[PDB]
Amino acid sequence: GEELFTGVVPILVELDGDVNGHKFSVRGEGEGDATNGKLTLKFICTTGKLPVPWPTLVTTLVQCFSRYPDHMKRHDFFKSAMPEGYVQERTISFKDDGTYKTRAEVKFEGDTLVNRIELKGIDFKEDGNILGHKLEYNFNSHXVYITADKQKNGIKANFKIRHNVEDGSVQLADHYQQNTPIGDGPVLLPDNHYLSTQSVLSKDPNEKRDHMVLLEFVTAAGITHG
Structure with a gap:
C-alpha cells in the first residue's frame, strides 16, 4: 500500500479513554507526509x-x-x-x-487515514507523576525496536519512553506492542530494525480548549544497505 503515501494524506484520530474511572475523549486532525517521515496534528480534549x-x-x-x-x-x-x-x-x-x-x-476511511483507539488505565497514584500532572510538556527522541511475528502474520515492537519530570527525574514508560493486519491480502514481514523518532509539543495561542499541537519526524534504520 506504499502508493497511498507518496503525497500528503489527511489524518483523523479518535480516542475514548478511562484512567482510574475518569472518562475522557480526544479528537485530532492533521496530515502525514511519509516521503519526509513528517506528522503535523492538533488534538483537543472533547x-x-x-x-x-x-x-x-x-x-x-x-x-x-x-x-x-x-x-x-x-x-x-x-x-x-x-x-x-x-x-x-x-x-x-x-x-x-x-x-x-x-x-x-x-x-x-475514503482518502483519510483514521486511527480509532480505546484506552483503559488502572493502578495509577493520585500523588504520582501522571495523575499529579508532574511531567514536563515536551517529548524525547526514542530507540522503536520492531521484529516479525510470523505466527500472527504481523509484527511486535518493544521500546522505552522517557518522560521528563518537573523535579529533574525521568518517568519511564515501557511499551509492548503487537500489530495484526485487518485484511487477508499479503503483507511485508520485516527483518529486525527500529524507528528513530523525534517530536515537539506546543500550544495554539487562540485555542481555549485543553489541547496539544504535535510535530513528529520518524525514519526507519538498523539495516545496512546491501
Missing part, C-alpha cells in the same frame, strides 16, 4: 480537562507515516497492510505507577 498529561498519550495517538529508506522498503509492514489497515495493541507500564492498555484500528 470532555473538558484531560485527566492525564498530554505527553503520556503521544505514542497512543500512525507508524505508516514513518520514512522507510529505499533499501528498507521490503521491511515496511505498516504501509503494506493499507488500505484495509491493521490492529495495534499495546500495554504501557509506567514505572512505579499505573498501566495503559490500548487497542486501535488504523485504516483508510
Whole structure:
C-alpha cells in the first residue's frame, strides 16, 4: 500500500479513554507526509480537562507515516497492510505507577487515514507523576525496536519512553506492542530494525480548549544497505 503515501494524506484520530474511572475523549486532525517521515496534528480534549498529561498519550495517538529508506522498503509492514489497515495493541507500564492498555484500528476511511483507539488505565497514584500532572510538556527522541511475528502474520515492537519530570527525574514508560493486519491480502514481514523518532509539543495561542499541537519526524534504520 506504499502508493497511498507518496503525497500528503489527511489524518483523523479518535480516542475514548478511562484512567482510574475518569472518562475522557480526544479528537485530532492533521496530515502525514511519509516521503519526509513528517506528522503535523492538533488534538483537543472533547470532555473538558484531560485527566492525564498530554505527553503520556503521544505514542497512543500512525507508524505508516514513518520514512522507510529505499533499501528498507521490503521491511515496511505498516504501509503494506493499507488500505484495509491493521490492529495495534499495546500495554504501557509506567514505572512505579499505573498501566495503559490500548487497542486501535488504523485504516483508510475514503482518502483519510483514521486511527480509532480505546484506552483503559488502572493502578495509577493520585500523588504520582501522571495523575499529579508532574511531567514536563515536551517529548524525547526514542530507540522503536520492531521484529516479525510470523505466527500472527504481523509484527511486535518493544521500546522505552522517557518522560521528563518537573523535579529533574525521568518517568519511564515501557511499551509492548503487537500489530495484526485487518485484511487477508499479503503483507511485508520485516527483518529486525527500529524507528528513530523525534517530536515537539506546543500550544495554539487562540485555542481555549485543553489541547496539544504535535510535530513528529520518524525514519526507519538498523539495516545496512546491501
